[PDB]
């Protein structure tokens, strides 16, 4: 509808796949080469379904900060025959607050979904499902029964992936450029 939705659509149309684990269907962001991200609560194993195709997982790393605190991001390298468009130059370098963000989801249940979530706070610490978690972004969100990830963008920046909510607020794990240095 406007330039924020334009940037979000451009990311969804080229840099997402539908990932299925034993814990459900998730929006999965492809970042570069065969490397993608997903919430750690997806519990990625040795095999994952990517757009309903059986795919070997070459590597999966549940990220933690240097205090050994959960970040809720898993980085997956997929045994896929095709590379993602490289979007690392759209990743922020530092922890920050944002205005006017969009949360975008693409699953069998929620195809082509875009939500203007407004202001995003650098919230920091969250007890997420009983797990102490750092680097959380927050945006007011009439919390919806179900987590299938999500992509949080502003114009020109891919800033996070949706990992949870409390009924009124939604929460995303930050994406930082430093996670994807090769």
Curated annotation (Swiss-Prot):
Source superkingdom: Viruses
Peptidase C3 domain ranges (all copies): 2-180
Subcellular compartments: Host cytoplasm
Reactions mediated catalytically: Selective cleavage of Gln-|-Gly bond in the poliovirus polyprotein. In other picornavirus reactions Glu may be substituted for Gln, and Ser or Thr for Gly
Active site: residue positions: 41 (for protease 3c activity), 72 (for protease 3c activity), 148 (for protease 3c activity)
Disulfide bonds, paired cysteine numbers: none
Function: Major viral protease that mediates proteolytic processing of the polyprotein. Cleaves host EIF5B, contributing to host translation shutoff. Also cleaves host PABPC1, contributing to host translation shutoff. Binds and inhibits host IFIH1/MDA5, thereby inhibiting the type-I IFN production and the establishment of the antiviral state. Cleaves host MAP3K7/TAK1, resulting in inhibition of TRAF6-triggered NF-kappa-B induction. Cleaves host TICAM1; this interaction allows the virus to disrupt host TLR3 signaling. Cleaves host IRF7, resulting in inhibition of type-I IFN production.
Subunit-structure text: Interacts with host IFIH1/MDA5; this interaction inhibits host IFIH1.
Protein name: Protease 3C
Biological source species: Human enterovirus D68
């Amino acid at each position: 509808m406007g330039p924020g939705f334009d940037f979000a659509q451009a990311i969804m149309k080229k840099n997402t796949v539908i990932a299925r684990t034993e814990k459900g269907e998730f929006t999965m962001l492809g970042v570069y080469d065969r490397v993608a991200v997903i919430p750690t609560h997806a519990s990625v194993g040795e095999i994952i379904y990517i757009n309903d195709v059986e795919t070997r997982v070459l590597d999966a790393c549940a990220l933690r900060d240097l205090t050994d605190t959960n970040l809720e991001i898993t980085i997956v390298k997929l045994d896929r025959n095709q590379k993602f468009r490289d979007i690392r130059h759209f990743l922020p370098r530092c922890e920050d607050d944002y205005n006017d963000a969009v949360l975008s989801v693409h699953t069998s249940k929620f195809p082509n979904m875009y939500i203007p979530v407004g202001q995003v706070t650098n919230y920091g610490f969250l007890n997420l499902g009983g797990t102490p978690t750092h680097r959380i972004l927050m945006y007011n969100f009439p919390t919806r029964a179900g987590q299938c990830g999500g992509v949080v963008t502003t114009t020109g920046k891919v800033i996070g992936i949706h990992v949870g909510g409390n009924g009124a607020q939604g929460f995303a794990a930050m994406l930082l450029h430093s996670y994807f240095t090769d």
